[PDB]
Write a structure and sequence with these properties.
Chain A: DNA-dependent RNA polymerase catalyzes the transcription of DNA into RNA using the four ribonucleoside triphosphates as substrates. Chain A: This is DNA-directed RNA polymerase subunit beta. Chain A: Belongs to the RNA polymerase beta chain family. Chain A: The RNAP catalytic core consists of 2 alpha, 1 beta, 1 beta' and 1 omega subunit. When a sigma factor is associated with the core the holoenzyme is formed, which can initiate transcription. The structure is cut from a larger assembly and holds chains A (about 100 residues) and B (about 1350 residues). By secondary structure, chain A is mainly α. Chain A contains four helices and three strands; from the N terminus they run E-E-H-H-H-H-E. Among the domains of chain B are: about 625-770, Orthogonal Bundle (Topoisomerase I, Chain A, domain 4), CATH 1.10.132; about 920-995, Beta Barrel (OB fold (Dihydrolipoamide Acetyltransferase, E2P)). In chain B, helix 26 packs antiparallel against helix 30. The radius of gyration of chain B is 40 Å and the shape is globular. The chains are: A mainly alpha (about 100), B alpha+beta (about 1350). The interface between A and B is large, with 78 and 116 residues. The complex binds zinc ion (2 copies). One zinc ion binds near residues 799, 801, 873, 875 and 880 of chain B. Chain B binds three DNA and RNA strands through strand 8, helix 7 and helix 26.
Chain lengths: ~100, ~1350
DNA sequence: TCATATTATTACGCCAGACAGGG
DNA sequence: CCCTGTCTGGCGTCCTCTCACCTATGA
RNA sequence: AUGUUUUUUUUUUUUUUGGUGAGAGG
């Protein structure tokens, strides 16, 4: 099985799972620890922001690849803003501070 | 873009500021059409239009007026994702307190209003009343009231009196709670009391009272008044395949809260009576509490069928919340997965990758390449071209592959060598071809395994895959110094068959002018691959400074050793191939090649090793047959001699001469002896079976048996497995844990019958159950370790210290187990090591000890090295580059940046699978004696007896290093003395552990002081001997009239005056303990070394109990202060022990549980770190008593003992840094001139920078005290709540952070993996240097 | 079809952490 | 009042693949 | 040498841009 780009889920902006659903590989927790074990800071940054979740990042990246410019414009993951709204939907005021 | 994440409470004004419209109706959707509800949960005006830039109902179907809201639609006009960020709010009719601040353990409202949880819930569920500023009545403010208590009060205090209930009353209490006022009171209460329990109970209440005043969190924000609703997009309502909507659980929760709130508003309209609106508000309280955190209240609500439905807190917490399932691990585009296979033609920087996966993973690069050439125009055309797969896109694909690495990943990645980057080579096929040597890194066999491929998209990621994660760059395991590209199984058989010899072959003893014609004689058919031969080889030894000097000579060698010499690079000597080359020898061949010639010859030489091993293993034809497993001819007579022996033992058992346990022990002993004899018979019969003549009489050699080369080469097989295929397969054990007395005398070449196979299945089912349940604890151990580490980044170059732990070789009592060169390899010395002669600067004080320095250490026989350890590093927030050590997979020091906490945590937890889950001293060598911790005396006979319990007996050799060590008890008969030379095997120690000696220092006469027969001691004349002994009783058997009497022996002179201790003016009286029996009676003159009484008496969960720092059930008790010791009160729960120091203050004591067999007498002076009883010892006692270096030596020795018992090589840096992360918190003792509190627990770097910026001023600092937290308590007690929330319980940590108003200055690895940016360790450390500089 | 709103099983194994009881 | 059983909560491995099954009521 | 010397309607518009549970592999 292989996946470059196709459909994703509803709640989250990450790719679907499985083969019958044309989906990508779950880059799990211990693989993130293995990339932290190296100096792979940029590989991990595209591994969890551009390739997976951030919608503006992935559309800009697809257009940047097909122009011939391997460069990522990262932004913030969508599932973290989902986390902010689920935490904030309690009596909890979680924010994002100064520039 | 943004610094720290701030968490605080949500005010009702803040919740109305989040909101966009009140969600009234609970009606979800229409359900018969497609439209929602106006205005229900899924509204239009409150949130937004379903369709993008459209009024859902009807107006604006173009792009001109985005925003207009007509009365017929009551709809906003924006994007489809606008509803995902917009949230609604439910105006709760009746106030409802939060469940996270009422049941968090400890509750936030429980230790703030000074009221028990039980009483808080009673009033909260409309079952109890609470008073609130009554007035001039006889009632308190916190005191509650019941129906009867209120009824009577109602008729009594009908006027000025307030007694409400529920959240409303609670809210008022919190609202009317002067925070500041309580502070002073609490502070004054803590300074006006001495109660230990109260002190801790008051310090925990004042801590959460002053923390609330420090932030902008109000006391009335605990109760929920304006409940917030999560965005619809985040609670999606999609239908499955069919005609119904599979609705989420949160819609059930919100719809019930809104149904109940509408009912409560209608009842407060209608003026229903009291009990109706109490049940109505109570059902609303339980509905809100079920929405927020379901199931924390009594049994959780359920929709379909009996399974409870999932609430908001269950969208956060757990293994499947947002942290562990969508933020730490994500699903990933440009990724693939398939079954692996070998492909041995590969070079070790490249892997095979199928054409179909390659054309799917590289669709955008192919699109960009196709658009560059000009073959097509629009993007559609290119997608049709690769959907059709024409003849021109495969050249495009070979031009996008070429220099573009991919990340191969095996699915259980345990350490960092399980993600490696290759270059693709395209494969006709559907299976990833993976280079074989690399398999030993992935733990990948080829029995059905699968791997995932990931594509580095951007340019920095291609460079990270080539420069950090390439497979040529990972040739040493980061856990140690051992190479991980060791040749595994076929190739060592090909080498072991190639470089060997036989006593006659084709071309025996002919002479050859080079290795080239050695291979030419092997190929043409004129010699054999193993035929001993003088060749002329030219080995290049590089003895100058970087210059290779040729020396050519004639080596008496074989043909195969010359053929393998054609592949060895220049610098290695010929003697690396002159031996037989098993697996350990080829591993040290690649290791010496890496240490001498560097990286590139070692990569190309690893490939040439693998190619020549595969080729000559193919030419070998090394099969396995049924005749290869040679049965010993002596096996049947050994079994019959064992059968005669068990027959003799059972004939004694019929006549009852021996006991049953001694029978079972004798049967297990003779079957162990017969098993060892059968193994030696088959091992001789395999290791030297070949006996071939050469030009005359016969001559023997090691065998070319196939199973023996598979065992001796170390390819696959050991002694035990080849033992079970030929000799008997031992004594298998039943699942009771005890062994079975009748062994399995049949191997596998003979047939096992039925019972023997069933006993075998006992033994093997236990092993499969152990692995399949062991793996969960191994993985959870790696998780706890990488979440306690998680932060620690090499961030300096020198901390500027002179402290470091004292690396000695470790010695258990056998031969010296782990040499000093294994422990001080590549670790930077603390002070400069003196050469063992006299005062020489052998090595300087900041040199890395690589192999050349360690060889000059081994030549001089250096005792022990004071070396720098990670736990002694002075760097605030990180570890400096010298106190870590060598890079371990790079030859140099650790770079500024490389995350060492994560590689250390992986290197400790990765061998978690291989670990298991469930008289006197006899010297061995011949050397010199030395004693430490010794205070001794010469007895009458001459044997130096010892008056100290804790004496260490070292055996030092003639060179200076310490070769043996032992522990000698109080009062033992030493055959030798101090500084003496002995012989190998001579007994040097003797004692009796069943009889605790009460030996003396001086001589004289014996008097019975406080020894009265009848109450103190008893008369027990011996039965079978007649020589009686006055038996000393204990303090429990005698009655209360004489229980105060302490029996003792004090030595006098010939007159009767007390003979004093030499050095003091005190007599030497020995107080006899309980259960003693007097050996030497009254009037008998004594000497030293003679007793005065007879006193009769682990694998992987050990690693968990060392890092998590549990206490053992019966710890060894110690002394918190030095000085004289005494006893106390007679058995009220415990038996007291009072320690009065010589110069220090007296009042320390401890109540010992009296079930322990003590070690100390009444006239004994103790010390800190000195034992009082025996058994295991908790690490907190080591930390608060001996020192920090003592507890780090304790953990690294007690866990390298597990990792060495199971045989795993791990360097000690990793355990020292997880020990650093254990003892990172501290507690204050004297607050000093700072802003801390008395017994406040604060982290160590904070208090150290505080009193280091105050001590640089005039003010003297604050004196701390370090504390050792276990790894899950230490990773949950962090100054970064996302780090402590991605890990275990999120409810406790988020309420603690919310009511404290905590802020997360990100500054670690997992905060930046959550929030989606660069890691502040690796390549991103320059980015975080830049961002930290530009503030 | 369109609002009404929650009851008659037990059978893990530590391991911390808080709580009423009593010498 | 300091030990103490006793009770309550909170953990318990990653990755993947196949299949089936989904609230009752109701004038 | 010369040409108002057989006229009649044989008619003008695009394209537009998803949970639950069970089982297997490693
Ligand atoms: Zn409209
Ligand atoms: Zn340091």
């Amino acid at each position: 099985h292989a996946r470059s780009t196709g459909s994703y889920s509803l709640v989250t902006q990450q790719p679907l799972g499985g083969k019958a659903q044309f989906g990508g590989q779950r880059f799990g927790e211990m693989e993130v620890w293995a990339l932290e074990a190296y100096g792979a800071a940029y590989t991990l940054q595209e591994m969890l922001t551009v390739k997976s979740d951030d919608v503006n990042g992935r559309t800009k990246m697809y257009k940047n690849i097909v122009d011939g410019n391997h460069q990522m414009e990262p932004g913030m993951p969508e599932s973290f803003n989902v986390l902010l709204k689920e935490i904030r939907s309690l009596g909890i005021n979680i924010e994002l501070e100064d520039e | 873009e943004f610094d720290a994440i701030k968490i605080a409470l949500a005010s009702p004004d803040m919740i109305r500021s989040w909101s966009f419209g009140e969600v009234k109706k609970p009606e979800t959707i229409n359900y018969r059409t497609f439209k929602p509800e106006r205005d229900g949960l899924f509204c239009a005006r409150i949130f937004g239009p379903v369709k993008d830039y459209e009024c859902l109902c009807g107006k604006y179907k173009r792009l001109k007026h985005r925003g207009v809201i007509c009365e017929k639609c009551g709809v906003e006009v924006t994007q489809t994702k606008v509803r995902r960020e917009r949230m609604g709010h439910i105006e709760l009719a009746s106030p409802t307190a939060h469940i996270w601040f009422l049941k968090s353990l400890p509750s936030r409202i429980g230790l703030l209003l000074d009221m028990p949880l039980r009483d808080i819930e009673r009033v909260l569920y409309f079952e109890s009343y609470v008073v609130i500023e009554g007035g001039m009545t006889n009632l308190e403010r916190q005191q509650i009231l019941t129906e009867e208590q209120y009824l009577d009060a109602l008729e009594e205090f009908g006027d000025e009196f307030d007694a409400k209930m529920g959240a409303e009353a609670i809210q008022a209490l919190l609202k009317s709670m002067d925070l500041e006022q309580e502070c002073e009171q609490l502070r004054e209460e803590l300074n006006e009391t001495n109660s230990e329990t109260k002190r801790k109970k008051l310090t925990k209440r004042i801590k959460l009272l002053e923390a609330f005043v420090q932030s902008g969190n109000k006391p009335e924000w605990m109760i929920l008044t304006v409940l917030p609703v999560l965005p619809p997009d985040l609670r999606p309502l999609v239908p499955l395949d069919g005609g119904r909507f599979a609705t989420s659980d949160l819609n059930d929760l919100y719809r019930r809260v809104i149904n109940r709130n509408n009912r409560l508003k209608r009842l407060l309209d209608l003026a229903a009576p009291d009990i109706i609106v109490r049940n109505e508000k109570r059902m609303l309280q339980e509905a809100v509490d079920a929405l927020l955190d379901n199931g924390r209240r009594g049994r959780a609500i359920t929709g379909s069928n009996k399974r409870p439905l999932k609430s908001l807190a269950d969208m956060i917490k757990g293994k499947q919340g947002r942290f562990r399932q969508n933020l730490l691990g994500k699903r990933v585009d440009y990724s693939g997965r398939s079954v692996i296979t070998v492909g041995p033609y590969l070079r070790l920087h490249q892997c095979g990758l199928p054409k179909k996966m390659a054309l799917e993973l590289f669709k955008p690069f192919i699109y960009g390449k196709l658009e560059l050439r000009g073959l097509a125009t629009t993007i559609k055309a290119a997608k049709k071209m690769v959907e059709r797969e024409e003849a021109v896109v495969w050249d495009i694909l070979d031009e996008v592959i070429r220099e573009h690495p991919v990340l191969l990943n095996r699915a259980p990645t345990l350490h960092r060598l399980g993600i490696q980057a290759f270059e693709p080579v395209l494969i006709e096929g559907k299976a990833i071809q993976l280079h074989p040597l690399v398999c030993a890194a992935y733990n990948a066999d080829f029995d059905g395994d699968q791997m995932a491929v990931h594509v580095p998209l951007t340019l920095e990621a291609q460079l990270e895959a080539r420069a950090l994660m390439m497979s040529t760059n990972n040739i040493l395991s980061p856990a140690n110094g051992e190479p991980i590209i060791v040749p595994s199984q076929d190739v060592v058989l090909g080498l072991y068959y190639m470089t060997r010899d036989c006593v006659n072959a084709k071309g025996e003893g002919m002479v050859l002018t080079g290795p080239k014609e050695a291979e030419r004689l092997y190929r043409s058919g004129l010699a054999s691959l193993h035929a001993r031969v003088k060749v002329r080889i030219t080995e290049y030894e590089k003895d100058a400074n970087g210059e290779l000097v040729a020396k050519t000579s004639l080596k008496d060698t074989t043909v195969g050793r010359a053929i393998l010499w054609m592949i060895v690079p220049k610098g290695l000597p010929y003697s690396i191939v002159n031996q037989a080359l098993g697996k350990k020898a080829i591993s040290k061949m690649l290791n010496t090649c890496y240490r001498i010639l560097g990286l590139k010859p070692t990569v190309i030489f690893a490939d040439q090793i693998m190619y020549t091993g595969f080729a000559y293993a193919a030419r070998s034809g090394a099969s396995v047959g049924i005749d290869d497993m040679v049965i010993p001819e002596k096996k049947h007579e050994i079994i019959s001699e064992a059968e005669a022996e068990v027959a003799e033992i059972q004939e004694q058992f019929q006549s009852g001469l021996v006991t049953a346990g001694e029978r079972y022990n004798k049967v297990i002993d003779i079957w162990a002896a017969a098993n060892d004899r059968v193994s030696k018979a088959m091992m001789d019969n395999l290791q030297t079976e070949t006996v071939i003549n050469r030009d005359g009489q016969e001559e023997k050699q090691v065998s070319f048996n196939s199973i023996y080369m598979m065992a001796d080469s170390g390819a696959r097989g050991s002694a035990a497995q080849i033992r079970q295929l030929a000799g008997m397969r031992g004594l298998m054990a039943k699942p009771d844990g005890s062994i079975i007395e009748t062994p399995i005398t049949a191997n596998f070449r003979e047939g096992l019958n039925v019972l023997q196979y069933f006993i075998s299945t006992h033994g093997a089912r236990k092993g499969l159950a152990d692995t399949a349940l062991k793996t969960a604890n191994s993985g959870y151990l790696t998780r706890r370790l990488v979440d306690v580490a998680q932060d620690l980044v090499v961030t300096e170059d020198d901390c500027g210290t002179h402290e470091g732990i004292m690396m000695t070789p470790v010695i258990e009592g056998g031969d010296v187990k782990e040499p000093l060169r294994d422990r001080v390899l590549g670790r930077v010395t603390a002070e400069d090591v003196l050469k063992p002669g006299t005062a020489d600067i052998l090595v300087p004080r900041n040199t890395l000890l690589h192999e050349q320095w360690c060889d000059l250490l081994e030549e001089n026989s250096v005792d022990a090295v004071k070396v720098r350890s990670v736990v002694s590093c002075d760097t605030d927030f990180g570890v400096c580059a010298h106190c870590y050590g060598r890079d371990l997979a790079r030859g140099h020091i650790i770079n500024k940046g490389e995350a060492i906490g994560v590689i250390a945590a992986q290197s400790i937890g990765e061998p978690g699978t291989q670990l298991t889950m469930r008289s006197s001293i006899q010297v061995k060598n011949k050397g010199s004696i030395k004693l430490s911790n010794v205070k001794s005396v010469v007895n009458s006979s001459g044997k130096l007896v010892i008056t100290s319990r804790n004496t260490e007996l070292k055996l030092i050799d003639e060179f200076g290093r310490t070769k043996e060590s032992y522990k000698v008890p109080y009062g033992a008969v030493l055959a030798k003395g101090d500084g003496e030379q002995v012989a190998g095997g001579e007994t040097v120690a003797n004692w009796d552990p069943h009889t605790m000696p009460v030996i003396t220092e001086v001589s004289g006469f014996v008097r019975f002081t406080d020894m009265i027969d009848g109450q103190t001691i008893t008369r027990q004349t011996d039965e079978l001997t007649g020589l009686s002994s006055l038996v000393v009783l204990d303090s429990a058997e005698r009655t209360a009239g004489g229980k105060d009497l302490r029996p003792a022996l004090k030595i006098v002179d010939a007159q009767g005056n007390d003979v004093l201790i030499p050095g003091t003016d005190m007599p030497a009286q020995y107080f006899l303990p309980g259960k003693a029996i007097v050996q030497l009676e009254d009037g008998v003159q004594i000497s030293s070394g003679d007793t005065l009484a007879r006193i009769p008496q682990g694998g992987l969960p050990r690693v968990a109990d060392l890092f998590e720092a549990r206490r053992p059930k019966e710890p060894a008790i110690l002394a918190e202060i030095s000085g004289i010791v005494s006893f106390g009160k007679e058995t009220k729960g415990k038996r007291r022990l009072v320690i009065t120091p010589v110069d220090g203050s007296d009042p320390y004591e401890e109540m010992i549980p009296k079930w322990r067999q003590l070690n100390v007498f009444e006239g004994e002076r103790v010390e800190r770190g000195d034992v009082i009883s025996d058994g295991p010892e908790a690490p907190h006692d080591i930390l608060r008593l001996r020192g920090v270096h003592a507890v780090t030596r304790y953990i690294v020795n007690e866990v390298q003992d597990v990792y060495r018992l199971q045989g795993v090589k791990i360097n000690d840096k990793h355990i020292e840094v997880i020990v650093r992360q254990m003892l990172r918190k501290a507690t204050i003792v004297n607050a000093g001139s700072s802003d801390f509190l008395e017994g406040e627990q604060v982290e160590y770097s904070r208090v150290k920078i505080a009193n280091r910026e105050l001590e640089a001023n005039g003010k003297v600092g604050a004196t701390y005290s370090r504390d050792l937290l276990g790894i899950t308590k230490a990773s949950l007690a962090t100054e970064s709540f996302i780090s402590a929330a991605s890990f275990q319980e999120t409810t406790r940590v988020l309420t603690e952070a919310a009511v404290a108003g905590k802020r997360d200055e990100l500054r670690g690895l997992k905060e930046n993996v959550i929030v989606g940016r660069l890691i502040p360790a690796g390549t991103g450390y320059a980015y975080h240097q830049d961002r930290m500089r530009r503030r």
